[PDB]
Amino acid sequence: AIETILVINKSGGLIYQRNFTNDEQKLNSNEYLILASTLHGVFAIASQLTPKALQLTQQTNIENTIPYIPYVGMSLGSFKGDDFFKEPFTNWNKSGLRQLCTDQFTMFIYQTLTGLKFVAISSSVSTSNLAIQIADNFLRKVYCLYSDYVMKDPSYSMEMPIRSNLFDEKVKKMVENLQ
Template sequence: MAIFGLWIINKAGGLVYQRNFAEGLAPLTSNEYLVLAGTLHGIHAITSRISPAAGSSSGAQVIEGETFKMTIMLTATGTKFVLLTSLAETTADVILQKVYEAYSDAVMKNPFHTPEMPIRSEGFETRVTTVIGIGQS
């Protein structure tokens, strides 16, 4: 049971927020994170169109590997919240919902935040810390 990291991807596929919470992730440069986020954005766009069932699909929600799980939450505005957790973690959906709440409060209502730009808001950091816990960096 561990939460490794949180990403927030804007509707254009840019990584606007990234924070690690536990050891275990390979150390990446910020550029590599941007590339990963962009790739995930593309994959997500594809998965939302290949659904065999009729009607629109929300796209990939969980991507699982042998050692980790990636839970993706797509909001109505196209922003994606991604949580990297261990396989056993069961609270990912709840946490993402709470992070979304914190995002709407501390980011969207903050006059000093420019939409679609990287999030640098102290209030949001604090809220995320209370939801998930103290991370590194």
């Protein structure tokens, strides 16, 4: 039951805060900027905290591959078919903040190879690995929709705030099925 999403372009700075809640509206718009930038900074600073046991010897390039959850999305745009993809894929942020679990919610993180970050706040609290496997697939559907409807846009400067209706209605359709 994902309740909110938000995406950070390449160097901090919120660019999307469409909240998927019935009626909460507790948090001001301004403070989400500090939220997103603080998440970016914590992502950066957790990188230099790998314990020295695994710093010099990882030997774990078999778990980075992520399995294929069949129909996480629904039931298209540039993509076509029953689903955006069929094969499994690989993790890109292998030494960064992936999850922040909490009594009332859970924040999943999905980092694009170029540098984009996608953040999914979900009220639902899944052995803390199956949750990541659902979340990474779903956030990559969101990333595919982003590349479809924000990159192929004339009136959109690079790494700037997102202001569109196709994108927000499409991701709303994506999430209202995922519950």
